[PDB]
Design a protein around this ligand. Structure first.
Ligand SMILES: N=C(N)c1ccc(C[C@@H](NC(=O)CNS(=O)(=O)c2ccc3ccccc3c2)C(=O)N2CCCCC2)cc1
Ligand SMILES: [Ca+2]
Length: 223
């Protein structure tokens, strides 16, 4: 997260770290056994780490659970990033409480101007790399479709939305991939792609989760 602030320990209780000997993507806990993340985060050998703040220190409240299966959307296209969403089933149910909790799926899509909270352990620098120990937070508005398509001509599908600041200086970045965009208590987006990080006129692009609620439900019901 570039231009964000330290969230505070466990203040984003649905945030997950995907770990394969190092943090490589974020995710969101949506019930005690299922996590949603991005399809580009797919990897075998994923351990989901819940209740994290400093990802480099055991502090208490962590729960480490292996993934028993990762289900990339059948129509994910790696060239366009259209349908960039994946479901991860946990080997065991997480223990939910104050510090580890699920986030609700949306019942409707959010409008342009809705302010949301984006969080992750990704890069904090626009030019360079600096990964934080603790979880970083950024408040950012959903942009209009016209501004989003003006920023990225021909690259925005109806399963994507832009969120952020056209002036540059505040954005998600490498390492935040798969993480939550929460608006009014609902999971509206998944960190997917962008051109650089926090560049002027190149806002972040997010997977539009409201288009996938039926697929998420049907898929969790059959697995
Ligand atoms: N909000 C941001 N500015 C932001 C958000 C997410 C990221 C991580 C993300 N990386 C990028 O978007 C790199 N910027 S990129 O190189 O300009 C880019 C953008 C879109 C693309 C679409 C399809 C294939 C390749 C693409 C590469 C990533 O890990 N990817 C996995 C590999 C494919 C690209 C996505 C970076 C920045
Ligand atoms: Ca920790």
């Amino acid at each position: 997260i570039v231009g964000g602030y330290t969230c505070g320990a466990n203040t984003v209780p649905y945030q997950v770290s995907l770990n394969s000997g190092y943090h490589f993507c974020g995710g969101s806990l949506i019930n005690s056994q299922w996590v949603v993340s991005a399809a580009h985060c797919y990897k075998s050998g994923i351990q989901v780490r819940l209740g994290e703040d400093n990802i480099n220190v055991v502090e208490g409240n962590e729960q480490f659970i292996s993934a028993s299966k990762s289900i990339v959307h059948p129509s994910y296209n790696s060239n366009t990033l259209n349908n960039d969403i994946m479901l991860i089933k946990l080997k065991s149910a997480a223990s939910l409480n104050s510090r580890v909790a699920s986030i609700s799926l949306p019942t409707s899509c959010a409008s342009a101007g809705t302010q949301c909270l984006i969080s992750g352990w990704g890069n904090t620098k626009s030019s360079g790399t600096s990964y934080p120990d603790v979880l970083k937070c950024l408040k950012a508005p959903i942009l209009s479709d016209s501004s989003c398509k003006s920023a990225y001509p021909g690259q925005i599908t109806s399963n994507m939305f832009c969120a952020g600041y056209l002036e540059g200086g505040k954005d998600s970045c490498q390492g935040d991939s798969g993480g939550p965009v929460v608006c009014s208590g609902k999971l509206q987006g998944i960190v997917s792609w962008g051109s650089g990080c926090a560049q002027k006129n190149k806002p972040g692009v997010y997977t539009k989760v409201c288009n996938y609620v039926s697929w998420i439900k049907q898929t969790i019901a059959s697995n």
